[PDB]
Design a protein around this nucleic acid. Structure first.
Lengths: 82, 93, 91, 33, 106, 95, 108, 79, 96
DNA sequence: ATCGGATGTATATATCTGACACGTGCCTGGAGACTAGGGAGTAATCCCCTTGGCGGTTAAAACGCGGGGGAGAATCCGTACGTGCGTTTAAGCGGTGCTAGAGCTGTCTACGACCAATTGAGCGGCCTCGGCACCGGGATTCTCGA
DNA sequence: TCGAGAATCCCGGTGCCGAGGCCGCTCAATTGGTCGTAGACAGCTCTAGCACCGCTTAAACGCACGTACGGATTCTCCCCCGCGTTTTAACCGCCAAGGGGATTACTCCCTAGTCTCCAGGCACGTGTCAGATATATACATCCGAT
């Protein structure tokens, strides 16, 4: 139903994210690494969130599921309840 | 009905900065911070009580949990504030 | 020069840096790979985005430190992998 | 399937995973020029 | 008459009865003493006041009369004690601290 | 001279099941005792938090199953879920 | 009377009754179901069997018939998932895995 | 003194177990500083745990709990 | 006479094969007592407490040296320097 | 080191809107008053295990010397990255419509807490034999100069 | 490539001390039965998540030029390694004293429960002003020509 959406994370967006981090010069191979790293991070968090959702016998993923999934892994997030 | 710490945070803000407001997003951040610290301290106090085979959480467990969690000068000032509150509370009734 | 200008400009502001709709599509794709016929609150996707940008920005700071240690100004994939290994995410 | 060979009437062979994944080690300064 | 709150006797602003209820209903121990909610509420109020006045200073240096998440981020990340306490916490819409490494400057 | 409990005899039974001609020292058994205690506490705490999130007052096999899924890595989680389900099915048909 | 243990009904080696008591006294919830201790004991037994099987293999490799903590460390650290589960755990008297970076080793 | 009892050959052996081949001359002072910081951090919590229980003796369980609360769980002394 | 670096590799293998403790026991015990002198005076230690502290310290230092070695190799060197320790502790999450 | 000078930056004022701050019901959660029972403080006793000392052995630590190889600089080459311009694309905003499905209320049973009687499982104490540690002699195997 | 020679591996012999069973015996788990309420389930409502269409305009994309940064090579010198001598303090065996850690029996006072009552703190409305945006201007800054 959906495919190659990882190419929707464009090169200028990665450049902006690097600039906020203070990076002055960037190689040409960074973009593939960044896409892989982001995909792995998203997989872990989304798996935890869907487990939390399916325990409550719901069908929509709520913000609290994401908040709990992030808290569980040591990525505590403020500003969406909790 | 859903409860929060909003009005108490607003009262403290009017105490320290008499002419400053706060937006709603920052109030949500502050509410989350208060809940987080509450859970941390209460859990550490529960662990202390279970280590020594007791069945009651007293102000002494809370003091030790505060000394275990907070770093540096924060622990000292928080201990002073809490001790003052407890002695004032026992003074009246 | 323009690089330093961009650094200052993006370190002074607080908006998000990735377009919302492609990120939403990617999130839906991965969740599809986990469970079929799922729905999302909008604030769920917004929380996912906030966490993802925070993670990537901190990782890029670590990468910059690693590159400067090796006497370079260009960040390279080897720096990212070293930072992730020392952080403990890889091994 | 040759990992463990007793659990009651059954064995510990059908239960334990047969191909565990070995842990891989990071190598810095890859000598791959 | 006969309606003086427990916080009023303790000389606090945070609620003591509510914290006592949360301690009692949170499955932390079988019994809860009398000074524990008081002492906890005092500590929480102290931490809140500390962070709030730092944030208000950050707000006046920006020539604003309201506090936004960026001000909370700036207050927390500039202080070493609070940065140790909240070292693994993300604040939404907060950004980062403006720092550039010295080997990058011209 | 006061009763203190440990998981020694059960660990030894499992060991005789797996390797019929192998022994174990005192310190290794101490390590194993600590490991069992640690894992028990992790799973039980996660189940407690799960029950409190959804506003329940009971810990059932469902809570333990979800906590096991959350805690253990993938293939370990799959096999552990299989073992627990098999054990509960066998128990609930026996009197 | 005392007829049959619960671990015999479930076909386990770990104690179902002791796990039930430990759950009921550990301040985890107000009530505890009937299948929770069974499920938990099965999981604990599975993990123990896994670790002990790997450690017994490591001990047999060294011409020994008795497991010491070194064998436990060798078993845990040589497995991806077990090393991920115990990633922040120190095993006393265990040592480290032998490994040398390839750059340091002479070639030819 | 008493930080000079962590001699140069001992630090050299600890580096060898970690897989190091060549050691600069200024490593030993850094290692002593790092070790002292780590020890202060752990011992403060151990003594806190001791004082809460109204004892005058530091036991193994105080050390185990102090290490556990810093995410450094140790197996072997827990019983 | 062996060439420089050979006995280093022999010692690496030998100390990665064994499981003993590498710091002398008595000086470590004296250091622990002197450090504990500040927080509370006239203390007592169980022997197993000091052994636990020693085990934790050895493990910490060995892992830190592994990260330091990686940082040193990354800069195209084989000699470890204090700045490698500093970078490892900063990225690991301890310097700041 | 010193000027054009073109560009991007920090300086006013106008206006306009939506979010914050305050004011009113009300209802449910917290305070007052009182009773009952067990958790925890306290004194007393036992004895274990921690601190301290002494003498001998010997292995580890400290010191010096020589040399080699590894860190550091200095120089040169080329190609990959940054900057800017013109063209193509798709995100974002505004509006319309349509259900899934979350959230709540009312019933009812099946399931877990609880208590008393019964008894076998697991823990502490005592012995013993075999697995492992240590030592000595003899084949292999790896470094290294020639 | 090849032999000194130093280090590593293998076999056999001796002894000791801790892992594995055996046996009492208490106390925690099992049986059986009672009772009360926590979830499961069914129905109902109405919110918000999903799908589609249209338009605009800012961001993404492709390409060309040139420079500055990464990498490779070479040279020097100094500092760390390997090895032999001399010194020192750690380790071990033995002995002796006493300070706290456990354990037990008593006693009381601090904390659950139970009713009753009343006020604090959520929802719901509503007004006005702080902050954003536009518009024009002044001042720093950076690059090229000297």
């Amino acid at each position: 139903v959906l495919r190659d959406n990882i190419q929707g994370i464009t090169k200028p967006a990665i450049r902006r994210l690097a600039r906020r981090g203070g990076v002055k010069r960037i190689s040409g191979l960074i973009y593939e690494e960044t896409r892989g790293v982001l995909k792995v991070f998203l997989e872990n968090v989304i798996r935890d969130a869907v487990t939390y959702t399916e325990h409550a016998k719901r069908k929509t993923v709520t913000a609290m599921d994401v908040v709990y999934a992030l808290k569980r892994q040591g990525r505590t997030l403020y500003g969406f309840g909790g | 009905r859903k409860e929060s710490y909003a009005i108490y945070v607003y009262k403290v803000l009017k105490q320290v900065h008499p002419d400053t407001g706060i937006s709603s997003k920052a109030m949500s951040i502050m509410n989350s911070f208060v809940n987080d610290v509450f859970e941390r301290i209460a859990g550490e106090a529960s662990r202390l009580a279970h280590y020594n085979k007791r069945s009651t959480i007293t102000s002494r467990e809370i003091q030790t949990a505060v000394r275990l969690l907070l770093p540096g000068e924060l622990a000292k000032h928080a201990v002073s504030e809490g001790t003052k509150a407890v002695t004032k509370y026992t003074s009246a009734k | 020069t323009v690089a330093l200008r961009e650094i200052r400009r993006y370190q002074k502001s607080t908006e998000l840096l990735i377009r919302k709709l492609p990120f939403q599509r990617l999130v839906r794709e991965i969740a599809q790979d986990f469970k079929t016929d799922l729905r999302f609150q909008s604030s769920a996707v917004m929380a996912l985005q906030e966490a993802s940008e925070a993670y990537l920005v901190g990782l890029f700071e670590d990468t910059n430190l690693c590159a400067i240690h090796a006497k370079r100004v260009t960040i390279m994939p080897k720096d990212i992998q070293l930072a992730r290994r020392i952080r403990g995410e890889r091994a | 399937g040759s990992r463990g060979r007793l659990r009651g009437g059954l064995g510990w062979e059908s239960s334990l995973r047969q191909r565990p994944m070995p842990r891989l080690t990071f190598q810095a300064g890859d000598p791959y020029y | 008459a006969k309606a003086k709150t427990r916080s009023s006797r303790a000389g606090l602003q945070f609620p003591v009865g509510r914290v006592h209820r949360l301690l009692r209903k949170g499955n932390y121990a079988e019994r809860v003493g009398a000074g524990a909610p008081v002492y906890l509420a005092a500590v929480l109020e102290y931490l809140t006041a500390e962070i709030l006045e730092l944030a208000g200073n950050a707000a006046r240096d920006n020539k604003k009369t309201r506090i936004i998440p960026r001000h909370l981020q700036l207050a927390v990340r500039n202080d070493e004690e609070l940065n140790k306490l909240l070292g693994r916490v993300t604040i939404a819409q907060g950004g980062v601290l403006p720092n550039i490494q010295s080997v990058l400057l011209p």
